[PDB]
Amino acid sequence: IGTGFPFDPHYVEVLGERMHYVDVGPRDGTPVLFLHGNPTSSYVWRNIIPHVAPTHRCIAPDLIGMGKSDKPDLGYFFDDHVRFMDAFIEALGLEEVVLVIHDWGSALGFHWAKRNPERVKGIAFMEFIRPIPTWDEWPEFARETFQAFRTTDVGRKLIIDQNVFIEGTLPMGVVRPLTEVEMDHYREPFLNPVDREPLWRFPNELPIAGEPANIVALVEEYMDWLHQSPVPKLLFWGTPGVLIPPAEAARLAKSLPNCKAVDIGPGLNLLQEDNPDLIGSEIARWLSTLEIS
Numbered sequence: 001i002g003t004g005f006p007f008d009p010h011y012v013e014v015l016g017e018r019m020h021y022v023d024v025g026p027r028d029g030t031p032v033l034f035l036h037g038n039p040t041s042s043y044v045w046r047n048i049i050p051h052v053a054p055t056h057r058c059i060a061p062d063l064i065g066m067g068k069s070d071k072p073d074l075g076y077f078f079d080d081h082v083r084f085m086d087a088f089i090e091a092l093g094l095e096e097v098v099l100v101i102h103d104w105g106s107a108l109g110f111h112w113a114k115r116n117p118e119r120v121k122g123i124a125f126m127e128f129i130r131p132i133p134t135w136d137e138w139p140e141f142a143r144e145t146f147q148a149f150r151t152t153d154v155g156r157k158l159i160i161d162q163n164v165f166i167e168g169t170l171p172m173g174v175v176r177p178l179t180e181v182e183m184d185h186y187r188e189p190f191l192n193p194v195d196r197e198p199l200w201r202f203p204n205e206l207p208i209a210g211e212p213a214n215i216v217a218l219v220e221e222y223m224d225w226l227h228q229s230p231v232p233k234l235l236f237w238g239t240p241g242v243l244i245p246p247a248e249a250a251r252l253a254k255s256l257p258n259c260k261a262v263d264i265g266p267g268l269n270l271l272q273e274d275n276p277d278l279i280g281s282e283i284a285r286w287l288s289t290l291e292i293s
C-alpha cells in the first residue's frame with residue numbers, strides 16, 4: 001500500500017478562492033470525479049486512481065479548507081462545501097461525469113447528482129452519508145466520541161484544540177496501522193489549529209437522530225432520488241464498517257436500482273486505506289461495463 005502522493009498539483013479559482021486538484025489520465029472521455037470526506041483529502045485516493053488513470057480522466061479535488069485547497073474563514077457548513085464543489089465542477093467545464101465518492105464527498109456527490117441526473121453516467125460509493133435515525137444505529141465503539149464531537153464546548157476542545165479527529169478518529173477508521181508517513185500526509189493541512197474548523201463542523205453536520213434537520217431533510221432527498229434512479233451504481237462495503245454496517249449494504253444492494261456491491265473484507269470508514277487494489281481494480285472494470293449496452 002503506497003504512501004506516496006505522486007501527482008502534480010492543479011489549482012483553479014473557485015468563488016474568489018483557490019482549490020487544489022489531482023488531474024490525470026486521458027483528456028478525452030467521460031471523466032471520473034473523486035470526492036474525499038472528513039478528515040482526508042485527495043490523498044485518500046492515491047492508490048485507487050492509478051487503476052483508473054489508464055482509461056479514464058481522474059479528477060480529485062481537495063474540498064475547500066482541506067488538503068491544499070485554500071482555507072478562508074468560513075464555518076465550513078455542508079452548504080459551503082456544496083457552493084464550492086458546484087462551482088469547481090463548472091470551472092473545470094465538466095459535462096457528464098462518473099462519481100467515485102466517500103464520507104462527506106458522498107453527500108456532495110449524491111446531492112449534486114440529484115440536481116444534475118442527466119449528467120451522472122455512474123456512481124461508485126462507499127462508507128457514505130445516510131440518515132442514522134437513532135444513535136443506536138451508530139457504531140457502539142464510536143458513540144461517546146461523536147457525541148462529544150457534537151458539542152461546542154468540548155467537541156471543539158477535542159477536534160480543534162487537541163486534533164483528535166486526525167490523531168484519534170482517523171487511525172481508528174482504518175483496520176491496518178497507518179504508517180507515520182501516511183499520518184503526516186493527513187496532518188499536513190491541519191498543522192495550524194486555526195485551520196481545523198472543517199473537522200469539527202462536519203461531525204456536527206452528520207444527520208443523526210433528526211438533527212441537524214436541514215442536513216437530514218437534504219440527505220433524505222438524495223437517498224429517495226437514488227432509490228428512483230437507474231444510474232449505474234457500485235457500492236463498496238466493509239466489515240464491520242462505520243457509516244454502513246454489512247447488513248445495510250445488503251439492504252441497499254437489493255433496494256437501489258441497478259446496483260452492484262463489492263465486499264472489501266475488513267474495513268471501517270477509510271475503506272481505501274484497507275483495500276485499495278480491490279476498489280481500484282473493481283472501479284476500473286465496472287467503468288468498462290458502463291460502455292456495454
Ligand SMILES: [Cl-]
Pocket residue numbers: 038202203204206
Ligand atoms: Cl464527520
